[PDB]
Amino acid sequence: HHLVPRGSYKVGIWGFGAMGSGIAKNILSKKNLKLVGVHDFREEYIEKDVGELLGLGKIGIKVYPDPITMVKQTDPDLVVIATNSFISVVKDQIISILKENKNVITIAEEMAFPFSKDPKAANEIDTVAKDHNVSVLGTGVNPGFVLDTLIITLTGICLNVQRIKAARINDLSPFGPTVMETQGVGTTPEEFKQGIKSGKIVGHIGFEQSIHMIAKALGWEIDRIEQKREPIISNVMRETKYVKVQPGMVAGCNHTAKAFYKNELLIELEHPQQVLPHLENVQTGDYITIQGDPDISMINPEIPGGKGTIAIATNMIPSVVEARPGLLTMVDLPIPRALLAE
Judged by the rule CB under 8 A, the positions of this chain that interact with a second copy are 1-3, 26, 29, 31-32, 141, 145, 149-150, 152-153, 155-161, 217-220, 292-294, 296-300, 303-304, 307-308, 310-312, 314-316, 324, 330-341
Q: How far apart are CA 143 and CA 205, in angstroms?
A: 8
> DSSP labels for 52-66?
HHTTS---S-BEES-
Phi-psi region of 133 (alpha: psi -120 to 50; beta: other; left: phi over 0): left
Other CB atoms closer than 10 Å to residue 157's CB: what's the count?
Answer: 9
Question: How many angstroms from the chain centroid is the CA of residue 248?
Answer: 32
Provide Rg for the chain, Cα atoms: 21
Separation in Å, CA 209 to CA 113, 204, 248, 329: 5, 11, 33, 11
Residue 237 contacts which entry, ligand NAD, a second copy, none (Cβ below 5-8 A, type-dependent)? none
Q: How far apart are CA 22 and CA 6, in angstroms?
A: 24
Residue 273 contacts which entry, a second copy, ligand NAD, none (Cβ below 5-8 A, type-dependent)? none
Nearer to a second copy, 160 or 198 (CB): 160
Smallest distance from ligand NAD to CB 71, Å: 13
Q: Which residues in the chain are immediately followed by a break of C to N over 2.5 Å?
A: 298
Report the DSSP beta bridge partners of residue 168. 286
Residue of minimal Cβ distance to ligand NAD: 17
What is the binding site for ligand NAD (CB under 6 A)? 14-20, 40-42, 82-85, 107-109, 140-144, 305, 309
Residue 159 contacts which entry, a second copy, ligand NAD, none (Cβ below 5-8 A, type-dependent)? a second copy
Residue 155 contacts which entry, a second copy, ligand NAD, none (Cβ below 5-8 A, type-dependent)? a second copy
Residue 58 contacts which entry, a second copy, ligand NAD, none (Cβ below 5-8 A, type-dependent)? none
Nearer to ligand NAD, 106 or 234 (CB): 106
Nearer to ligand NAD, 9 or 64 (CB): 64
For the chain, what's the residue count? 342
Smallest distance from ligand NAD to CB 220, Å: 22
Nearer to a second copy, 243 or 313 (CB): 313
Residue 95 contacts which entry, a second copy, ligand NAD, none (Cβ below 5-8 A, type-dependent)? none
Helix runs in 56-165, H state only: 67-74, 87-98, 119-131, 149-155
Other CB atoms closer than 10 Å to residue 180's CB: what's the count?
Answer: 20
Nearer to a second copy, 105 or 303 (CB): 303
Smallest distance from a second copy to CB 47, Å: 28
Nearer to ligand NAD, 20 or 51 (CB): 20
